[PDB]
Amino acid sequence: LEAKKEENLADWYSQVITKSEMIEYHDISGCYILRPWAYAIWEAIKDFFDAEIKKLGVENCYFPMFVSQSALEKEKTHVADFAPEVAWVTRSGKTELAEPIAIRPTSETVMYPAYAKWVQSHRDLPIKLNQWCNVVRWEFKHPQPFLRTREFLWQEGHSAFATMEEAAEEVLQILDLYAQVYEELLAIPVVKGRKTEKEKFAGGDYTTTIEAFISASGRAIQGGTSHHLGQNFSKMFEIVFEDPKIPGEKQFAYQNSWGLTTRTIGVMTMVHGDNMGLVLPPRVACVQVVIIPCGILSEEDKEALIAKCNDYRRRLLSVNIRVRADLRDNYSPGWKFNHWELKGVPIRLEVGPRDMKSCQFVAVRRDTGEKLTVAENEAETKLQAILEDIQVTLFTRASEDLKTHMVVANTMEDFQKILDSGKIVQIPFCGEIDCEDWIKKTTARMGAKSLCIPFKPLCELQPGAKCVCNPAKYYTLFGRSY
Amino acid sequence: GLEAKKEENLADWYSQVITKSEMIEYHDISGCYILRPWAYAIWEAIKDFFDAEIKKLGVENCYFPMFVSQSALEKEKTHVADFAPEVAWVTRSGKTELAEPIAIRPTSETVMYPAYAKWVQSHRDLPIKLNQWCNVVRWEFKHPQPFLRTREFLWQEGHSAFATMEEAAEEVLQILDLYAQVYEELLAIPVVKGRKTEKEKFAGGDYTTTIEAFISASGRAIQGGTSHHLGQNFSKMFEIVFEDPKIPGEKQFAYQNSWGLTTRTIGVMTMVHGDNMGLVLPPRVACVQVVIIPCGISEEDKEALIAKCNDYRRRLLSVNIRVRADLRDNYSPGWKFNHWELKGVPIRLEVGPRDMKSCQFVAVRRDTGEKLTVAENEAETKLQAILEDIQVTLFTRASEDLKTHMVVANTMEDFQKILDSGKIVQIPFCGEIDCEDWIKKTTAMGAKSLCIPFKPLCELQPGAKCVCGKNPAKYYTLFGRSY
Numbered sequence: 005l006e007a008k009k010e011e012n013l014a015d016w017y018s019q020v021i022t023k024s025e026m027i028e029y030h031d032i033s034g035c036y037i038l039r040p041w042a043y044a045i046w047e048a049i050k051d052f053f054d055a056e057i058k059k060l061g062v063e064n065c066y067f068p069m070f071v072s073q074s075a076l077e078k079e080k081t082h083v084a085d086f087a088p089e090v091a092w093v094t095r096s097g098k099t100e101l102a103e104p105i106a107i108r109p110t111s112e113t114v115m116y117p118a119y120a121k122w123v124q125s126h127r128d129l130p131i132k133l134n135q136w137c138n139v140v141r142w143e144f145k146h147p148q149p150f151l152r153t154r155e156f157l158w159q160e161g162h163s164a165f166a167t168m169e170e171a172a173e174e175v176l177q178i179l180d181l182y183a184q185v186y187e188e189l190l191a192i193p194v195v196k197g198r199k200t201e202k203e204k205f206a207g208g209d210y211t212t213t214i215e216a217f218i219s220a221s222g223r224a225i226q227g228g229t230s231h232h233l234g235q236n237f238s239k240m241f242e243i244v245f246e247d248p249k250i251p252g253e254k255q256f257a258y259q260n261s262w263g264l265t266t267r268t269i270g271v272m273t274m275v276h277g278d279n280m281g282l283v284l285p286p287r288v289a290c291v292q293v294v295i296i297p298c299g300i301l302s303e304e305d306k307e308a309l310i311a312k313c314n315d316y317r318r319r320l321l322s323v324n325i326r327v328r329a330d331l332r333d334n335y336s337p338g339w340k341f342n343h344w345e346l347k348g349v350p351i352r353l354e355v356g357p358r359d360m361k362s363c364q365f366v367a368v369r370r371d372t373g374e375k376l377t378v379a380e381n382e383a384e385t386k387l388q389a390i391l392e393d394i395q396v397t398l399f400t401r402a403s404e405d406l407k408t409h410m411v412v413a414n415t416m417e418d419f420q421k422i423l424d425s426g427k428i429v430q431i432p433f434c435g436e437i438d439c440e441d442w443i444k445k446t447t448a449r450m451g452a453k454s455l456c457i458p459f460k461p462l463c464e465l466q467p468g469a470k471c472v473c474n475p476a477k478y479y480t481l482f483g484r485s486y
Numbered sequence: 487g488l489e490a491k492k493e494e495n496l497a498d499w500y501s502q503v504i505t506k507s508e509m510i511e512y513h514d515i516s517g518c519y520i521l522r523p524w525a526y527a528i529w530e531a532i533k534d535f536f537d538a539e540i541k542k543l544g545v546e547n548c549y550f551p552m553f554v555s556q557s558a559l560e561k562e563k564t565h566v567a568d569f570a571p572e573v574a575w576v577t578r579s580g581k582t583e584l585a586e587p588i589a590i591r592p593t594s595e596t597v598m599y600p601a602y603a604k605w606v607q608s609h610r611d612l613p614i615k616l617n618q619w620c621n622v623v624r625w626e627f628k629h630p631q632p633f634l635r636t637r638e639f640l641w642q643e644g645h646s647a648f649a650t651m652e653e654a655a656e657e658v659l660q661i662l663d664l665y666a667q668v669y670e671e672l673l674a675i676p677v678v679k680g681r682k683t684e685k686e687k688f689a690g691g692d693y694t695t696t697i698e699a700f701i702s703a704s705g706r707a708i709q710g711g712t713s714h715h716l717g718q719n720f721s722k723m724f725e726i727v728f729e730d731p732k733i734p735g736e737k738q739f740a741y742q743n744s745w746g747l748t749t750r751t752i753g754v755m756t757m758v759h760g761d762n763m764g765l766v767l768p769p770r771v772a773c774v775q776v777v778i779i780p781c782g783i784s785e786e787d788k789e790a791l792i793a794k795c796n797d798y799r800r801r802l803l804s805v806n807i808r809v810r811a812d813l814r815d816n817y818s819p820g821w822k823f824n825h826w827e828l829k830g831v832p833i834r835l836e837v838g839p840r841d842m843k844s845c846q847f848v849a850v851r852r853d854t855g856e857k858l859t860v861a862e863n864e865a866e867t868k869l870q871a872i873l874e875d876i877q878v879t880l881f882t883r884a885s886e887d888l889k890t891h892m893v894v895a896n897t898m899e900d901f902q903k904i905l906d907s908g909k910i911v912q913i914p915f916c917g918e919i920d921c922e923d924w925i926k927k928t929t930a931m932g933a934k935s936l937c938i939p940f941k942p943l944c945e946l947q948p949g950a951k952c953v954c955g956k957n958p959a960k961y962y963t964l965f966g967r968s969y
């Protein structure tokens with residue numbers, strides 16, 4: 005494949021997603037086809053996350069994709085700048101609808117009137133619901149596959165609680181799971197943090213987040229969000245119960261909402277991706293081991309080359325390794341090597357006739373590319389061991405890049421000095437909005453925006469330190485971002 | 487506590503139980519309904535099974551855009567003039583009218599087939615077998631019900647493209663037997679397989695296959711699943727061509743199938759097994775198979791009443807039985823008795839205070855009202871035995887309730903008599919379209935062609951004449967009232 009990754013990041017990414025068979029383009033701009041190689045990743049992420057939130061009592065469901073005209077701005081759910089991102093159905097066939105229907109850009113306007121009818125007492129809480137679904141956002145700044153699409157797949161959770169304490173607990177549990185996804189499955193290191201006033205979801209009380217860093221572009225990307233909504237929506241959609249113990253006080257529910265999208269797949273491509281194609285974290289690669297015969301003129305033993313391949317396959321499916329034998333004879337073995345490497349398969353297993361009656365095979369890992377040979381009997385054992393060092397390696401190496409590329413700055417000239425080195429940086433920060441619109445202006449003369457306030461900043465903020473001016477309220481992570 | 491009796495008022499009875507079993511909730515937009523977890527659970531079980539089966543025949547899951555361009559939807563003869571009012575069109579983004587109307591997927595052929603054309607550049611690239619679970623909008627043609635006919639629904643869409651007709655035609659009937667499996671092995675609804683007539687099959691295809699279940703209470707059958715052989719109709723329009731390996735420089739157009747199954751299943755299972763005190767759920771699809779409920783309401787030993795339920799719970803989770811202890815205090819056992827019966831849980835497990843010191847408990851079945859009593863120490867043995875026999879009941883009772891209402895008519899003489907007591911009937915039928923618009927007008931709200939059954943109730947013989955009487959009969963056709 006043509007591109008490097010230092011070079012022109014976009015075109016490299018354009019080619020890796022297309023030539024690894026993950027994405028296909030579509031007539032309608034900003035929409036993309038998820039071919040099975042990519043969709044499988046989403047399924048693995050969804051299978052992990054789904055097991056997780058059922059242990060916390062969340063149940064899956066499905067809500068309509070359509071929201072009323074009346075219902076959508078019946079309440080101050082979103083801010084005025086969100087109106088342009090809403091797609092409207094105007095016509096059915098060619099008979100104009102009496103009233104425009106909107107395609108859900110998020111489900112809050114669709115679920116919360118249901119919560120209000122379901123909740124008529126203390127018994128009815130908590131409500132913890134999840135749905136995996138598609139949402140369209142006519143996203144104004146320009147799209148690229150995965151990172152920012154115009155239709156995309158996500159799960160969105162909405163839970164309603166009677167007491168504050170339970171809500172604030174579920175906000176961080178969900179956030180730790182998101183971090184689990186990025187770090188246990190995708191091998192991406194993340195920073196947990198809270199949004200500022202400029203960047204928090206206006207209709208809530210506070211917004212939690214994880215932030216990943218793409219060194220090649222030098223930008224951070226927010227990989228997931230968990231809101232504590234308090235009762236802003238409770239009192240607006242009138243989700244009230246009366247407790248007979250506390251006679252005669254309207255009790256509003258405490259609500260959270262949380263979401264995680266296919267931008268996850270884009271982040272894993274960008275950070276682990278090389279100039280030989282994709283690189284797949286083993287615990288997410290739909291195929292972890294591809295079996296190939298090579299040898300790297302005779303007749304009857306070529307079906308015995310292929311009968312041993314399907315034995316290799318079956319024996320490790322009994323060890324629950326996901327495996328595909330590539331028994332196509334149409335292609336040179338060398339061609340399949342490039343082919344499955346551009347798709348980033350972690351382990352290639354070569355079995356040749358002169359190595360077969362050696363009672364063995366060679367394995368090549370996609371991480372480093374070195375070759376080893378391990379007992380035919382010792383296959384279950386050793387191949388699964390190799391898949392795990394592949395994962396810890398890709399976590400470690402991407403960890404080393406985030407570790408190197410995140411540093412502390414205390415003044416503005418050297419926050420600017422190190423930010424134009426393509427690194428993200430934590431600064432003492434006021435926290436107020438106008439101080440922040442300014443930082444991003446004075447860093448163009450794109451600009452650096454608030455990524456988050458890390459729960460665990462890199463250094464303690466000392467008493468009386470100021471940001472630019474008012475004194476500094478916390479160390480916040482700043483940087484250029486998607 | 488439920489209002490309607492099915493016998494009395496079918497529409498209201500159906501509206502009453504789907505809400506009060508907490509399966510669906512209504513919504514501002516007509517024909518749209520929220521699937522609460524109790525319904526979505528049924529759907530997920532179906533999908534965990536169907537996905538397992540069609541993966542063994544090599545289909546792969548994927549996701550295609552929901553928006554279809556004007557050009558592509560009206561590109562070729564995919565649909566007909568009838569089929570373009572049911573399509574929802576997005577025209578504006580915010581207050582900015584879009585240059586070109588975007589249409590919301592009523593099916594995905596027009597999204598996928600441009601993609602097959604680029605993926606297929608030789609016969610090595612075939613077959614292509616893709617499935618997607620997704621939502622579909624059809625702003626359709628009469629007043630709606632939850633499940634049975636909605637305006638957005640969930641389904642799976644299978645699309646396969648082949649080099650030879652033999653392989654394609656093979657997959658159309660493989661798929662259909664899976665649909666029959668879900669309806670029959672999972673849902674305990676017996677079905678009849680069939681082919682559509684020329685009016686009723688998918689116009690853009692060559693022949694389209696179907697399963698039909700029968701709901702007695704209204705007297706109507708329902709189309710429960712769909713498998714089309716498309717021939718080279720679409721390959722020729724969307725130009726899915728490959729080079730022939732033997733004939734230098736000649737295109738072969740691909741052979742295509744498409745098959746689909748919708749959440750309309752859950753509705754028909756509501757209609758079929760639902761009784762007059764609410765739903766009945768076949769156990770291998772019931773998200774919870776056992777409800778444990780304490781009964782009898784001193785504290786120090788009622789704490790041993792609630793701890794004994796939780797050993798059953800743990801004991802039955804070790805047999806991979808899905809079980810719920812409902813140990814809530816804010817509700818009386820009678821209220822739970824009701825609550826879970828309207829949700830159709832197969833086995834209710836009541837424990838009353840001296841049955842703990844008897845080393846007993848009582849088990850109640852959801853179909854019959856049966857009660858047994860079994861020793862504490864039996865965990866594996868008896869509860870699974872009843873969980874599996876409950877399923878055999880729901881199947882047969884609906885099976886012979888199909889053998890009830892599906893009878894032979896060879897003449898009209900009794901066919902209209904044989905149609906309108908809540909009957910479905912096979913007739914000798916011409917095969918041509920207007921004898922059928924006639925049969926349905928001579929019945930009235932008409933008797934429609936449901937399908938042409940594979941494997942009918944009696945063999946036909948030469949020179950038999952249709953109900954039309956003019957032209958002779960090419961096959962026995964399944965007729966009846968139908969949604």
Ligand SMILES: Nc1ncnc2c1ncn2[C@@H]1O[C@H](COP(=O)(O)OP(=O)(O)OP(=O)(O)O)[C@@H](O)[C@H]1O
Nearest residue numbers: 143150151152153156226227228229263264265267
């Ligand atoms: N257009 C999009 N394509 C893909 N993922 C998206 C898109 N918009 C948002 N996301 C993801 O959805 C998650 C929850 O959505 P959210 O409502 O927080 O979006 P947002 O804050 O408007 O996004 P952003 O700040 O990136 O513009 C985020 O963690 C983000 O990663």
Ligand SMILES: O[C@H]1CCCN[C@@H]1CCCn1cnc2c(Cl)c(Cl)ccc21
Nearest residue numbers: 082086089109110160161229261262263
């Ligand atoms: O962060 C997610 C997690 C999942 C639940 N919902 C919040 C909503 C974010 C709030 N939010 C973001 N973009 C929005 C648009 Cl475009 C509209 Cl119209 C309305 C609201 C919008």
Ligand SMILES: O[C@H]1CCCN[C@@H]1CCCn1cnc2c(Cl)c(Cl)ccc21
Nearest residue numbers: 565569572592593624643712744745746
């Ligand atoms: O059985 C499914 C499986 C997936 C492929 N398509 C067929 C039926 C399409 C045939 N088909 C049925 N209803 C349709 C409407 Cl409303 C429109 Cl607009 C267009 C086509 C329609």
Ligand SMILES: [Mg+2]
Nearest residue numbers: 089141143144
């Ligand atoms: Mg946005």
Ligand SMILES: [Mg+2]
Nearest residue numbers: 199203204226
């Ligand atoms: Mg944001």
Ligand SMILES: [Zn+2]
Nearest residue numbers: 434439471472
């Ligand atoms: Zn400041």
Ligand SMILES: [Zn+2]
Nearest residue numbers: 916921952954
């Ligand atoms: Zn006729």
